[PDB]
């Protein structure tokens, strides 16, 4: 936990990240602990949820953060959830045995349509409901049955 | 038998050694069961029991991190403004404010400046109304950026107001008091009194009331006091009879006090005070909300030390602790005076000794229990207890804080004590020793000068008025109005804490140094004559209407049913996919910058098109409302409950025709309304981190855990019969320390082992690690549709890939894997998933069970292989020969996974990559983490009171290991171009 | 309770007080509750309190000032609750 | 020792019964004893006599 | 390793009590939770040492040898060392082969 | 050594579980010689897991994260996977032979 504050801080420091702009740190390992593999996958899956909701779910067995993080001015510990009113990119970190570090950036979908055509877009838009209303009805079958 | 009596003899022996020593100790069973039931007989059974010890040190939980609550508390304020959840007419915005300025730094100051600078006001009403909030509340911010801490309580005043339906029902609210809508215009109708005791921008502008917090606010209250009345809240003194009667200068200090209060907040920096029974609902509990506003060390104490109540105390804390200030919750039972000899010495030694290392200034000793219809003649085992508990062992806890004075050499800072004290003595009854306790609480007054521990200890009796609200008083709020009607003041659980808290003040404090001080805050009900029968008189008037009405009421409705002769919906679970909401193309262009259109190559941006999980908490689904909301929605409880197998869907002849979800044992039907009242705490007990479940890991017990010992055979064993084979393998195996002789009669041969030889003895042993995250109890591959050949072929992490991946596909709205095909080459479809350790379970398999000579399949081998989960996906759904690239990295490996699909699809390789990652959890791995000290012990975890709900708390003080999971999860990613064209849904960029 | 301030209130004391005020109230209320079993409601036993005109005056007396202040209690008792037909108090403040 | 061994076990006779039931009846005592001590703790010698 | 005598384990059920044998009081409480009523375990006064007996009807496991057929491999030649490269003992000591 | 040694109680280093791990390899590598921050991707591919380990620096090389990359793949001969080999009937019998 210090490690990766430290290192999240300091990638922050050096890219000019504005000051009293910190970075909101969710810890979704508290409520489901830690698959030796899996993190990282579902560490993602719920990145792309707060991408979609803009919710911020906050760690809610972050009874008190340790004083020694409090060095870290680019990071915010939040106990609660926050409903902000939109997220556009999310980082994603993990350290495996073995010096195994690895990140990813996740950013909001819908900056992908800026960079298509009108008709593009529409013709998407008509496509993915199709898609959705038959997804619906196989999931349902398939779910009962 | 004689011959074996003989040898015994020769042998010298004795056979009935111990039964003769069984008979003794039976004998001395009896006489310490006789002593116990002499005194259970003597002191009762709610005595005995209640005495036992709830405290201990390493239980105490402290909660100081301030810094990071105030920047929560302000983002928190400033959506719920942008969102509309707060207005300017409401109290909320001042009293965050309050609590933001008790907690301003500079850290604090720049980020809101921030938030704040770059708020487009442009964007609607509410933004330009937080940016004007923000921005006075960075001036008030930056003006007492070095100024103390204050308590200041900006809520409504409320009074008491009970109606009767038509029916007869009653119905009690705290409505808004018409005269007093602050807590100045509170102490002013004090000070005032009543006949009886005749011997601002608030809710229309808050930006304007926050404005105004830092202003330090000329006649005092106590001048507008009328000559020859008694205020509401008034101070005693002693005259040389001895009696205590109102004094006008006292009292004018005491309400000068409270005003000052009122108008500019009161600080409690340096404080250091114990309370007890302040738990929610109480007198207490105020009492500490502004105990911490004001920036006091506390240390608070509870009888019913749990996960609830640690997390209430964290909620306060996080929301009014001030700079500076700090909280402890330790567990305690004021009945035990061990406990309180215990709690009194952790608070005093040194911090080294695992003590706090601190000197009380106040001691505010509010615990207490019911008694409700205990009269003279039913004063029992409960009733010694309470007794204890209010007078002994608050004077035990007294002389404990003065020794630890005393032994210091501290003579120059005395605590002071506020007596709970009650105007009451005897006058209701039915309440056991209540007012024993209350009266026997005021020899203090006298013992302060009589005795030696006047410059340890100051008194400070309160005499607390009628209270609304729980504790003791809740039950009367019914006739708070009437009890008003008279003149007199009854009083919310605030406004006491605010009256209570008035004796803290420094002035309050200087006075009592000088000499004991009686404050009494009856708010006038002393004059009441005959309190019992009146308030028997109010209660019975309103118990006589409201009965009278609902009969007669009844009695019409039957005459008119008689003499004469809506449907409504419930709701059912409509469990929906949740795919992005797609926008107009309008606010879409708005979004990205405008040079963007044509600027991309669109086969080398990847996205996210669909995600799943298999995890502790079931599906993405389920996990995201438990991790987001932390409850279930219909359609969660409805699909966790679908999980986990409580409930299965029927659709036939149930003699009716019935189609819906039924129970999967009993076959009942089940509505969706009622499968949260029958399932949803059994799906929460047996979801997520939990104790380990043996059934879910083969009969793995954490707690006893097999193992087998060497021994070398001191003497022939008896003979065993085997099969030829069989002998033959033992003669190889133990050459001459064995004999293998054929029987002749059945074919059969006898296996002797000798003198020498190696055996195995199966031993037991204790692990510490208990807890895991484990998928729901119930979950079952047969539910999603898995075969049984599959599930009995397969390692059971195979099943949570497979059930991931096809969750995924659905995700992304491919209901069929090979309308993939239909858009791109079977060449073109990778997967590029891992673990970091496999199918560990066939590694059980083939390095302990086959040495141990148990069925495993021949094929155990290709079943525990990393890539073997990928080669099953690919063998049952995908077909593909794209490419296959298993990545194993640890704990990083979905990482890994995702860096490896994304290389793949930019180099050509693919166009649609299966990315993620996936674990098991079993014995062997768990006491491998366990022996390199990774995870968190989990008995160390149960001596400092933390349950399995609370062991993972990351980034917190405290945090001692990680806590072991299981499941897997899966991505589809593939090129934005080829996603744009098959309509798939896209979740993000990667 | 001889030389026995606040800080040295231990088992002796609570013995004391148990003496001194949980057992005559228990007394009393045991022989309510004979009377009661009885239907005696027209011969009450008059109780004659031992008090002390000092409540903490002198000090090193234990719990001997809580006691006899806990005994002063019975005077509203006697109206706020039902054995005042089978007892009548009569607190004595014994001088010295 | 080990004809009378073989003797004992030939009569269905447990050696070692005795010894079982006063090792139970020992945890006993102590366990009554650890109570009768809490509440000689918290209630002090001169209450308890 | 020798392919041409595999060590296995079978569990067996004991017929009759078995010797007496000292194990240390740790062991012993071990053997006892494992086990149960199977087994019995008493110290011995003078050494603070406890005998286990274990019991009729209790578990084993007796050591069996099995003729494996692949008795070929292609190994590293007889006689390599990572030393003679440089490693360290320590490394040797630490790391899998 | 974690799934029979301390099954019998023989005497296991405490770290046995992290030198089992497929990526502990590469991580001594770097750990002992390299001493790089560059990218690890550890590939598990049976008996093909050279041919991918080439695949996959081609790749990390050409996507401009690495210009210098190791690969290559390695494997040990035991006791368990020989006869496990065995049982599937993927080797050649000896006593056949
Ligand atoms: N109108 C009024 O309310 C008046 C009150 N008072 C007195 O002032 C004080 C105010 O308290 P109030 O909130 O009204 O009453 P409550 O009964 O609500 O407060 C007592 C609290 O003490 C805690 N507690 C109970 N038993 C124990 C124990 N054995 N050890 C430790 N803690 C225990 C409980 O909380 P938890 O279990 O959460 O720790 C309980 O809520 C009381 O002493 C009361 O007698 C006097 C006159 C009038």
Known sequence: DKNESATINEMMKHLGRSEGNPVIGVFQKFLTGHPKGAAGAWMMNGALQILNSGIIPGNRNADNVDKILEQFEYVLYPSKTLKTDGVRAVSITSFGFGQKGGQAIVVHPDYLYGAITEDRYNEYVAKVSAREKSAYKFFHNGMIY | RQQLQVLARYLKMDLDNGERKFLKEKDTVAELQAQLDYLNAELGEFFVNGVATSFSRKKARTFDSSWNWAKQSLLSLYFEIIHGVLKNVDREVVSEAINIMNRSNDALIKFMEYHISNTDETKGENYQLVKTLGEQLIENCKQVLDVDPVYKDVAKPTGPKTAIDKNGNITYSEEPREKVRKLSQYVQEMALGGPITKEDALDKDSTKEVASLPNKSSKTVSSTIPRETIPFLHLRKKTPAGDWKYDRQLSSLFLDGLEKAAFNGVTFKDKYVLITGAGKGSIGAEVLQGLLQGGAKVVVTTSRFSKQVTDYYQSIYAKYGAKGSTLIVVPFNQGSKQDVEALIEFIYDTEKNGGLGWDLDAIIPFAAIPEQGIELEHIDSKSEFAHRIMLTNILRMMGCVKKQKSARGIETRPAQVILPMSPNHGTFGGDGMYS??????????????????????????????????????????????????????????????????????????????????????????????????????????????????????????????????????????????????????????????????????????????????????????????????????????????????????????????????????????????????????????????????????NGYNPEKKEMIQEVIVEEDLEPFEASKETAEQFKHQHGDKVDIFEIPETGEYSVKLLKGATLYIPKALRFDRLVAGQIPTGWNAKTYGISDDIISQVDPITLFVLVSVVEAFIASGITDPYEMYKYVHVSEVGNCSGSGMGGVSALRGMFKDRFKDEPVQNDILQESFINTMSAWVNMLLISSSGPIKTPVGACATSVESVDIGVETILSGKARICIVGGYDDFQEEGSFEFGNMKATSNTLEEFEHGRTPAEMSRPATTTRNGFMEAQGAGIQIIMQADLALKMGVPIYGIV
Not at chain 2, 436 to 441: D, F, P, Q, T
Not at chain 2, 478 to 491: D, L
Not at chain 2, 532 to 550: D, G, I, N, P
Not at chain 2, 662 to 679: F, G, L, M, N, Q
């Open chain 2, 436 to 697: 024993e306790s209350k009266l026997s609480l005021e020899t203090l007054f006298n013992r302060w000068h009589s005795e030696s521990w006047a410059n340890q200890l100051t008194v400070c009796g309160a005499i607390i008025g009628w209270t609304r609200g729980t504790g003791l008083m809740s039950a009367n709020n019914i006739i708070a109005e009437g009890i008003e009607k008279m003149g007199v003041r009854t009083f919310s659980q605030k406004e006491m804490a605010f009256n209570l808290l008035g004796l803290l003040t420094p002035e309050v404090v200087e006075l009592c140094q000088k000499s004991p001080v009686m404050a009494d805050l009856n708010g006038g009900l002393q004059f009441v004559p005959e309190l019992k029968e009146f308030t028997a008189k109010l209660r019975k008037e309103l118990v006589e209407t409201s009965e009278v009405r609902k009969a007669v009421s009844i009695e019409t409705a039957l005459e008119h049913k008689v003499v004469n002769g809506q449907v409504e919906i419930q709701p059912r679970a409509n469990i929906q996919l949740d795919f992005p909401e797609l926008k107009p193309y309008k606010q879409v262009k708005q979004i990205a910058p405008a040079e963007l259109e044509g600027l991309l190559d669109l086969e080398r941006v990847i996205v996210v098109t669909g995600f799943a999980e298999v995890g502790p908490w079931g599906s993405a689904r389920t996990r995201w409302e438990m991790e987001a909301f932390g409850e279930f929605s219909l359609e969660g409880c409805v699909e966790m409950a679908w999980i986990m197998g409580f409930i299965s869907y029927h659709n036939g002849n149930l003699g009716r025709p019935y189609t819906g979800w039924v129970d999967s044992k009993t076959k009942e039907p089940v509505d969706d309304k009622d499968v949260k009242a029958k399932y949803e705490t059994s799906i929460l007990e047996h979801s997520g981190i939990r104790l380990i479940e043996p059934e879910l890991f």
